[PDB]
Amino acid sequence: APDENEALKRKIDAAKMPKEAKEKAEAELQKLKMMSPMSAEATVVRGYIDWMVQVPWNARSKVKKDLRQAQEILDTDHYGLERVKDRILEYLAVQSRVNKIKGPILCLVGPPGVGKTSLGQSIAKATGRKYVRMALGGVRDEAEIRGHRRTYIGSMPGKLIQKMAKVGVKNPLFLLDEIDKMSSDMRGDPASALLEVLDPEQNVAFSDHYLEVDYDLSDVMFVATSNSMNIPAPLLDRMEVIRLSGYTEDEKLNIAKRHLLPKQIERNALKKGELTVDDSAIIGIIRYYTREAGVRGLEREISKLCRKAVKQLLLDKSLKHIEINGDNLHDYLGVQRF
């Protein structure tokens, strides 16, 4: 009879819905229809029904079957990283057939700084797949992967259930950033809940504590990246280990010239010809302002380098263009660190 109390079915059957969750959603509506300003149940089910709609099922993005188009971008987001470029392609060649992903999840390990999350961005762009990230740092219980019960207010579903609410497709690229930091002390171990989400036998029967009914996940392509090897043994099993650590000066220079410099020039509100940073200034950042195997502090210095450039142009409009080389790099980054 009311407006919102009647506008619940406007997205239960209008939006797609499976079989076991169809009438079960209305079975949860059975606890309603009695009153409306009532509290507890009349306020939890409406939130529960709301969380039952924003979750995607029978709705996905079309993944292509092409292969070189992925090779065409695995050299775009970087270059190839010597080898390993083929691996990512080798993994996507077998996934171009039956939808059950099934294979070892893929694990991008290495020192902090190496393109781990960035590689996860390209694999989603390669297969036309949507991207979402879930950092596994600070998780110390099972109440994160699998949500809480359907108690009073607050008890929201699992973290992955909330990520599916954003990316409204059944086939997103779920990144598990830094699985090393995943602690297992409080409520059992999140690795047990992390097994049923990637294991091919029970990924289709993933049950969340809040969202009562199960939720298929055999169409999601998971990418679990980290740094060290401190991961639970049942997780390392059935996961493809990909190691990448080495980074030379010339490799850091190429990454900065193709990606790090164009990215920070744009973010810092600089136009195309407003800032020129030649190769010596990039090398000077590597040798005296950043010590690292990856390129994170290399990118941290450019975010400051382009920062001061837009500052100098704003404090002196008589400047149309700032040039930074190995000689005047210390005027912007301050004194050298190493």
DSSP three-state, residue 245: coil
CB closer to ligand ADP out of 12 and 134: 134
Q: Taking a C-beta distance cutoff of 8 angstroms, is the pair 33, 145 a contact?
A: no
Instruction: Count Cβ neighbours within 10 Å for each residue of 33-47 and write b for 16 or more, e otherwise.
Output: eeeeeeeeebebbbe
Residue 288, strand partner residues: none
The span from the first CA to the last CA of the chain, in angstroms, equals 71
Member of 101, 114, 126, 211 binding ligand ADP (CB under 6 A): 114
- Rule CB under 6 A: say whether 242 interacts with ligand ADP: no
- Rule CB under 6 A: say whether 78 interacts with ligand ADP: yes
Residues 6+ apart with CB under 8 A from 168: 54, 56, 59
- And the tokens for 294? 């990856």
Member of 115, 147, 158, 190 binding ligand ADP (CB under 6 A): 115
Window 117-176: residues binding ligand ADP (CB under 6 A): 117-118
Member of 63, 116, 132, 281 binding ligand ADP (CB under 6 A): 116
Shortest Å distance, C-beta 195 to ligand ADP: 24
CB closer to ligand ADP out of 22 and 296: 296
Member of 299, 302, 309, 332 binding ligand ADP (CB under 6 A): 299
- Rule CB under 6 A: say whether 180 interacts with ligand ADP: no
CA distances to 122, 197, 249, 323, 327 from 282, rounded to whole Å, are 25, 42, 10, 12, 11
Window 251-270: residues binding ligand ADP (CB under 6 A): 255, 259
DSSP three-state, residue 186: coil
- Rule CB under 6 A: say whether 296 interacts with ligand ADP: yes
Shortest Å distance, C-beta 85 to ligand ADP: 11
CA distances to 54, 130, 186 from 150, rounded to whole Å, are 17, 29, 20
CB closer to ligand ADP out of 32 and 244: 244
Window 181-220: residues binding ligand ADP (CB under 6 A): none
Which residue ranges make up the site for ligand ADP (CB under 6 A)?
78, 81, 112-118, 255, 259, 294-296, 299
